Amino acid sequence: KLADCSSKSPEECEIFLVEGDSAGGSTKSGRDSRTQAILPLRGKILNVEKARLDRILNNNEIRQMITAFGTGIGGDFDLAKARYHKIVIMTDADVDGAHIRTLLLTFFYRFMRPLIEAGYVYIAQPPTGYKGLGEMNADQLWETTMNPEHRALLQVKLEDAIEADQTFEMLMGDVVENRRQFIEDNAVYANERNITSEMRESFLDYAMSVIVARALPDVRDGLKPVHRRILYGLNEQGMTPDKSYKKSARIVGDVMGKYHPHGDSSIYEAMVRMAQDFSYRYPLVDGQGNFGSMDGDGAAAMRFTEARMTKITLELLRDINKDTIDFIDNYDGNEREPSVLPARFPNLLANGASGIAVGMATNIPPHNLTELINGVLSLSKNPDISIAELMEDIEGPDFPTAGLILGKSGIRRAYETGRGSIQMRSRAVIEERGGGRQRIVVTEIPFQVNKARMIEKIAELVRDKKIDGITDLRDETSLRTGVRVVIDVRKDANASVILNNLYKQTPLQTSFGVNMIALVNGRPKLINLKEALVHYLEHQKTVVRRRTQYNLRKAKDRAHILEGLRIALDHIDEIISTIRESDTDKVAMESLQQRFKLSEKQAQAILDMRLRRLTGLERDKIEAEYNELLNYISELETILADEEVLLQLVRDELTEIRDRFGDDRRTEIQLG
Amino acid sequence: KLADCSSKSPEECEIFLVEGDSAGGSTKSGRDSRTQAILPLRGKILNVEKARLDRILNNNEIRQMITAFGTGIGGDFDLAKARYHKIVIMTDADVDGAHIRTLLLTFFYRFMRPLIEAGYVYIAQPPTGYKGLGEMNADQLWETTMNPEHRALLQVKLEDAIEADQTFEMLMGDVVENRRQFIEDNAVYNERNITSEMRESFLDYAMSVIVARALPDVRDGLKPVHRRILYGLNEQGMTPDKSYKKSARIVGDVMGKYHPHGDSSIYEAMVRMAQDFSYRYPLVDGQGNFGSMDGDGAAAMRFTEARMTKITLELLRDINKDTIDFIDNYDGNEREPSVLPARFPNLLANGASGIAVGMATNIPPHNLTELINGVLSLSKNPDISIAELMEDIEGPDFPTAGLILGKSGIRRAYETGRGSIQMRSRAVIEERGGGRQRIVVTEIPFQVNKARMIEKIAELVRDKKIDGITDLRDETSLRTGVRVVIDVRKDANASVILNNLYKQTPLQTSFGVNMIALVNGRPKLINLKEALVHYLEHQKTVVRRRTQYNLRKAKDRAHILEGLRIALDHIDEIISTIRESDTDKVAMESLQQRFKLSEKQAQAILDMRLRRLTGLERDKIEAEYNELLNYISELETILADEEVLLQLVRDELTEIRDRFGDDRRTEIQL
DNA sequence: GCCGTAGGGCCCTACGGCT
DNA sequence: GCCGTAGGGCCCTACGGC
Ligand SMILES: O=C(NCCCN1CCN(c2nccc3ccccc23)CC1)c1ccccc1
Ligand SMILES: *O[C@H]1C[C@H](n2cnc3c(N)ncnc32)O[C@@H]1COC(=O)O
Ligand SMILES: Nc1ncnc2c1ncn2[C@H]1C[C@H](O)[C@@H](COC(=O)O)O1
Ligand SMILES: [Mn+2]
Known part of the structure; x- marks a missing residue:
């Protein structure tokens, strides 16, 4: 499943995460192969904030990622053994990619925090108007989104461990009542990135989408x-x-x-x-x-x-x-x-x-x-x-x-x-x-x-x-x-x-x-x-x-x-x-x-x-x-x-x- | 996979073999569950005449069919151990259906020959022009193909064991030149006999593939x-x-x-x-x-x-x-x-x-x-x-x-x-x-x-x-x-x-x-x-x-x-x-x-x-x-x-x- | 653990001729 | 064991309430 890059020199290698293979082929045909590795996933990933550790560690896509990163997790986590210094998220430009995206941050956040702290994690910004990246032509994907000269990666900033934990607890956690109340309050029915800003915006846009339009x-x-x-x-x-x-x-x-x-x-x-x-x-x-x-x-x-x-x-x-x-x-x-x-x-x-x-x-x-x-x-x-x-x-x-x-x-x-x-x-x-x-x-x-x-x-x-x-x-x-x-x-x-x-x-x-x-x-x-x-x-x-x-x-x-x-x-x-x-x-x-x-x-x-x-x-x-x-x-x-x-x-x-x-x-x- | 019937008397029990669940769903619906079982396969089964005996037995569909009949295979066969006195081949009404038919017979004839001798092998007759049986409502699949009062089955008849050996070897055996020479030879641009089905059915398939695929x-x-x-x-x-x-x-x-x-x-x-x-x-x-x-x-x-x-x-x-x-x-x-x-x-x-x-x-x-x-x-x-x-x-x-x-x-x-x-x-x-x-x-x-x-x-x-x-x-x-x-x-x-x-x-x-x-x-x-x-x-x-x-x-x-x-x-x-x-x-x-x-x-x-x-x-x-x-x-x-x-x-x-x-x-x- | 809209993908078969 | 049209089908994941 891993299309890896050739250079074995962390500092200049980066890995892209995508929703699956339809997107893989356009990203494999458009990447600069020397420094960019591709990982396809399988649509919605596990919500790890909700599921327990035996489910977590026995899930096919999470394993591949941990493997891919060489860092181990949780305690074991270690920053020296990181195989890439840019881990880039690049989901569909659609509300369902915005959700997958929050599903990955939650995962990174609970098992790979130090990673967001060295500023290793990034979000990619593909242009809207495609169904998935499997709809883009090869060069075009590369030029607007993967070429290091014209591209616009948002680097993930963590500013407040306290705020972050709560954020995650509410949005992804099992208590529906505080997630619900998050929506009522914020819903409106009609380049570095703050992880809480992103989590809050991305999950809202998906929630409002699922509620009114699904x-x-x-x-x-x-x-x-x-x-x-x-x-x-x-x-x-x-x-x-x-x-x-x-x-x-x-x-x-x-x-x-x-x-x-x-x-x-x-x-x-x-x-x-x-x-x-x-x-x-x-x-x-x-x-x-x-x-x-x-x-x-x-x-x-x-x-x-x-x-x-x-x-x-x-x-x-x-x-x-x-x-x-x-x-x-x-x-x-x-x-x-x-x-x-x-x-x-x-x-x-x-x-x-x-x-x-x-x-x-x-x-x-x-x-x-x-x-x-x-x-x-x-x-x-x-x-x-x-x-x-x-x-x-x-x-x-x-x-x-x-x-x-x-x-x-x-x-x-x-x-x-x-x-x-x-x-x-x-x-x-x-x-x-x-x-x-x-x-x-x-x-x-x-x-x-x-x-x-x-x-x-x-x-x-x-x-x-x-x-x-x-x-x-x-x-x-x-x-x-x-x-x-x-x-x-x-x-x-x-x-x-x-x-x-x-x-x-x-x-x-x-x-x-x-x-x-x-x-x-x-x-x-x-x-x-x-x-x-x-x-x-x-x-x-x-x-x-x-x-x-x-x-x-x-x-x-x-x-x-x-x-x-x-x-x-x-x-x-x-x-x-x-x-x-x-x-x-x-x-x-x-x-x-x-x-x-x-x-x-x-x-x-x-x-x-x-x-x-x-x-x-x-x-x-x-x-x-x-x-x-x-x-x-x-x-x-x-x-x-x-x-x-x-x-x-x-x-x-x-x-x-x-x-x-x-x-x-x-x-x-x-x-009676 | 097998949807069984309620009765345990093979006497009155028959089992219908279909292409899959598109077709099985419409057959499970229309059946009389008392006497009428359904095993759905999955597309083309293995051609045993070109396969190795190890591979054949490992093969999932093969195995389910064996268990279904519950009779064992070859020298271990047992006609008194047969769970249904009628095995019914009910494929889609299309060239690939025919193909699958022929394949299924080849399996039957090489391993469960005495099931065709015992008169236990039938072929059903769905109507033509449906892509699958799943395109049919249940009731209409019942009135035509499955109800004992209206259905017209074919009892598969073995007559000459030697023309049937030469024929299976020719159509399904691994020497093309004979099979090719058979098409050329025959190309034109109730009870049933096994050899006669096999030629007419394989020919309907082959000819389809050759002129329209x-x-x-x-x-x-x-x-x-x-x-x-x-x-x-x-x-x-x-x-x-x-x-x-x-x-x-x-x-x-x-x-x-x-x-x-x-x-x-x-x-x-x-x-x-x-x-x-x-x-x-x-x-x-x-x-x-x-x-x-x-x-x-x-x-x-x-x-x-x-x-x-x-x-x-x-x-x-x-x-x-x-x-x-x-x-x-x-x-x-x-x-x-x-x-x-x-x-x-x-x-x-x-x-x-x-x-x-x-x-x-x-x-x-x-x-x-x-x-x-x-x-x-x-x-x-x-x-x-x-x-x-x-x-x-x-x-x-x-x-x-x-x-x-x-x-x-x-x-x-x-x-x-x-x-x-x-x-x-x-x-x-x-x-x-x-x-x-x-x-x-x-x-x-x-x-x-x-x-x-x-x-x-x-x-x-x-x-x-x-x-x-x-x-x-x-x-x-x-x-x-x-x-x-x-x-x-x-x-x-x-x-x-x-x-x-x-x-x-x-x-x-x-x-x-x-x-x-x-x-x-x-x-x-x-x-x-x-x-x-x-x-x-x-x-x-x-x-x-x-x-x-x-x-x-x-x-x-x-x-x-x-x-x-x-x-x-x-x-x-x-x-x-x-x-x-x-x-x-x-x-x-x-x-x-x-x-x-x-x-x-x-x-x-x-x-x-x-x-x-x-x-x-x-x-x-x-x-x-x-x-x-x-x-x-x-x-x-x-x-x-x-x-x-x-x-x-x-x-x-x-x-x-x-x-x-x-x-x-x-x-x-x- | 299932109700029902959502994301996402993989594996068996036939068939012939080259290796 | 691959090539290229054909037959056929299954599993993971989110989400909330009970
Ligand atoms: O999008 C359409 N069709 C998609 C084909 C869907 N395949 C149908 C069968 N698929 C599978 N079926 C059973 C088991 C499977 C196991 C792994 C992968 C796919 C499987 C994979 C998806 C479509 C077809 C006609 C008209 C409009 C859309
Ligand atoms: O991968 C197996 C198939 C391959 N192979 C190529 N060409 C042939 C022919 N003509 N016959 C058998 N196999 C061929 O070789 C591998 C090993 O062979 C088998 O066990 O089938
Ligand atoms: N109302 C309900 N609430 C929780 N479980 C229910 C349930 N009805 C059936 N189950 C089953 C599903 C699981 O097999 C197991 C426990 O739940 C779990 O851990 O997913 O019990
Ligand atoms: Mn009750």
Whole structure:
């Protein structure tokens, strides 16, 4: 793995650390080989501030580095035996390289301090706008970043042992609470180097990145960027329900050239999760081929699979090209993307969310679309509606895997505060199997409980004689039968006691521990149910208001044009003779505007008209269209005038989603 | 790996063998778990007929299959110890599936023969046109392939143990000539019998590899996966003037439209085309880490970026002018080119290597200036000898430079299509001070890993097989270019060590020329005069069809323009006519009726916008027709005479030589 | 120790002809 | 034992809560 330099003279040799081999080859092809050694790593390195010494010292990349440096570590560390006098960090110019970078400083800091103290450690500054250094051309990497004559290494300064320790303790250490509070305080949601300055800046930039632009969903359409991009990716290449499937690999290439500069499996498996009906309560993707199973199996590889939108997914993208939502430059400015989807149903809650961020994490369960909506409706009529009153409509989450939820206290605590624990329970019955003996039949398991892994924890529990009663465990699941897991019982054993044991002892009963965080105005926030429904319904007010302002503007732009087309066709031949006497396109435009009182666009419209638009009935079609538009226009000014009318539309259109898409509660909420 | 079934009665238990987890996942889903086990393998299993008995038993997949059957092997076999009374071969429905099939049988037949005797070996029948079984939903894989009520299996039948021994030895044994002679022999361009499957299946594989994988086309020099690559770039306008599109987009364009195969096959093959130490006239221009002379792979395709070079435009030039026959891609959803115009002789310029089935090919690059001088000579002399030609084309011309030792292998190679040609690094001895010397190498042979080469040397010094060396450094720099230094012990002879380096290490290597290409969709060993004769014949046709095409299009455009011209003449009559027809269709009939126009001159008049009644625009129409009229009669000239035509191919060939023709890199020492 | 978006990469097979 | 298209798949790491 080590491409070493040739000179064995420490003082003038330096070593570069890079994220892996894609970067290695460009750095090996660009280095001055005499004095510069290259070490590739393997992406995210161990956080050593967190992991203990047996893990540390048995980690492949740390070993190589210690070896590489010849210094030993900790006590043993010694500065004379250093094989290089410049150890240079040179990670991707991206937030994930900024993190790797803090992961290395932490490591150097806890095991190789004297090294930062002799001023041996440096950070390299490659130019932004590449995905990794494996995207740079050889010379260019060398010239802007590795050539000792034009390059700009930041040398790492340690100024205060006290400050440094604390810094590290907070940012990299296991206590999430002080790392979280570091963020709230410093976050702004919109050449020698001080190691504390660097650690603080670099980890923040990564945290703020992970929080707003990765791991947590938006309140308004329920999605995290990758899902938004994918789903935006499909829409743009109209890979719609009524059209045939399309190749998983083209979709993912497209999405990764255009909206998502992250790896292909982070994206392809995002798309798969959206296709699985045991993951999404209302699947957003339609899946052709092997897309996984409840025994944890991965999808086929993405050359085999094909996909397109679910019908429900169109209701997220409806009204998108009517100015409803702001577009933003994508990562490289060659392309535009939606900052949010219209989302004509409350996605966040219906399909829920799970996500791990920094200094926090989120976990929102799925719900039943019929309930949500009826709930949104009640609140549309009563801004003061209480949480007791919402749970008349929304009984509680509703899993794609169904099963039971034991009681309303947890639901209640979690809808009131955004936090609470809900005990999920498999659907199990006890039934006879002939010969005077019984069995347990579970046919439904909790949400996010791997069945084969649960079926092994059970086998394990009987293998290790921690449970008396069980005579055989089989998995009789199939497409025909559905999920069917059978557990025989030994003759005469009570089977209720045995089932109950399994609930306490196995994932057969799991706790979903709700933590309803989502992105409210690009800043993360713990919300309870009413907050969530309010932001969403605030979002629909803007989606309809803006679609209607759009249509009105469009409608007026048209009627102006028909005002001009009417006049052509009412003066046709003197229009024709105006054009013919004139030589250039501009001089014609000059003459019509002035002659028949036109605007630029009208004259322009008149000049773009085909002769087939002069056939006889054409005049009338026009007049017929002008009048209906005037009507139309009037209506849309009604709807922007009266807030109640505006908010009455939203309902109507909401009432129509429910009608078309709403389905029966799957998960039962036993009480007691 | 094995997903077992619930029952322990082999009676009713059967086990389905698939390609992997892409395919196993869709099979695990669709199965009846009671009676139906699944062992997923991993791609091509070892060919036992060419393997050693130690290797075979160590082999992971082999072992899992043995355990699965639980019957032991050879003399320790036991038919009463069989865990499933039906073993089912359920591979992808593609040539490689077939291949894997044949391989699996070979294992069965050599070690578990009594399993085919006992009637325990079956072959499943998934539907065709899926890349894998993983492309299939579970339920649909169940209704077709796995459900006892609908599935149509084949019980593999052994009939004659001796034709089956001769047959396995022939197809899967390590003597090509028989296997080759089998393809030639058989090449055309329920219950089942084992021999009869083996021939038909191996033949489906071999034939696929030979015509649609491993062998270039004598016309454009391209394997299918390269051609598809260059068209993918064309059909996304990824041209050199435009910026650099991401490697993942292309690779994804190509896969789904064109090439139903692994994405690492594509990207690596597009990679090769960007590297200036591999291609003599690099076809792809890449932004980022594209590998090294030291064996370094390219960077992952999420990072790298690429477009056409300038010279690939020439391979593609006029592709869309019906210069070439399009054909239906794999799934019937797109059109892809059978071949590219190839406006310079790519096959020979960039050369080619591919390991086929029953045959291989290995052709070297050449210098484009000489190649084109060659073709010119041939155009004005059909009866030119390989030797005449050789006055133009000295010999090959590697992109890595170096020295060729002699002309005899070359001569041989162009007369017959086969020969050895000995390649040497360019190397020189020079002082370093103090009497002492070094050896400094600067170009190295084609296809030689500069790193592997150095290590080999370092192993030889350490093991003392080579004497008189005191150091060994690679001082290659992008700035100074390739530079390998070897420090001779004082007083030692440097020229002897050197000729010792050339005997023992890749410093000298041989290229074994073997010029097998596809001539009319059929694999053939050709020679220099045929490589160039089949190229010229392709130029004649490419250019003749374009100039035909270009004439059909002008004559159509002329026609329409004679329409617009009549409109402008009688414009107020036209107005009149159109205003007094209620509908378009009634205008259309009246306009044709009225002014003696064809159906198309009328639509185009109905289409004309008004802006085209302005003075400039009027003149614009008159310019187009006089110009095009004159163009037409030029096209008509060319087509009238084979010689004016041929001379055109020469003036176009000459232009390209002029523009991209470059200096010789490899020296031929007499 | 697993839920799910992120960074990062390596190894078995077939096939032919040269060494 | 390498060359070059093909079949096929696996492991490490961060991050937070339970
Ligand atoms: O970026 C894309 N593909 C990347 C190829 C991913 N390889 C897929 C298979 N890989 C591996 N699979 C199993 C085991 C592995 C073990 C070591 C290294 C790679 C492995 C390594 C990564 C892509 C493909 C098509 C369209 C868009 C992107
Ligand atoms: O690395 C092994 C393979 C190499 N080798 C080169 N050429 C041959 C041929 N023709 N046959 C066998 N091996 C060849 O030599 C090394 C040792 O050989 C084996 O054990 O295979
Ligand atoms: N809620 C929980 N908290 C901590 N460990 C849990 C856990 N659930 C399962 N485990 C397993 C994982 C490890 O095998 C081991 C201890 O944790 C550890 O050291 O990583 O126990
Ligand atoms: Mn429990």
